Structure 1
């Protein structure tokens, strides 16, 4: 008598995370008249 029994398996996992934040700010200002300390402020 002869007997054989066998099994095999393959498995995977993956995970990801990602983030991207982007920003722009601009300001433009003009003042005329006044005194330079407060006009500066």
Structure 2
């Protein structure tokens, strides 16, 4: 008597994670009149 049993198996996996943020601000201001202590403020 002769017997033979055989197998092959394969597996794969992946994962990904991502983030981004962006900000921009501008200010423009003109003061005319004041004491420059509070014209500054």
**TM-score when scaled to structure 2?**
0.90
Aligned-residue offset at 1:3 = 1.0
Please identify which structure carries the higher strand content: 2
SS at match of 2:4: strand
Deviation at 1:2, TM superposition (A): 1.5
What is the alpha-carbon root mean square deviation over aligned residues? 0.7
Tell me which residue corresponds to 1:8.
8
Query: Structure 2: which 5+ residue stretches go unaligned?
Result: none
Which deviations, in whole Å up to 9, do the C-alpha atoms of 1:2-41 show, x marking residues without a partner? 2110111110110000001011000000000011010101
Aligned length: 41
5+ unaligned residues in a row in structure 1: which ranges? Answer: none
TM-score for the superposition, normalised by structure 1: 0.90
TM superposition outliers: structure 1 runs of 4+ over 2 Å: none
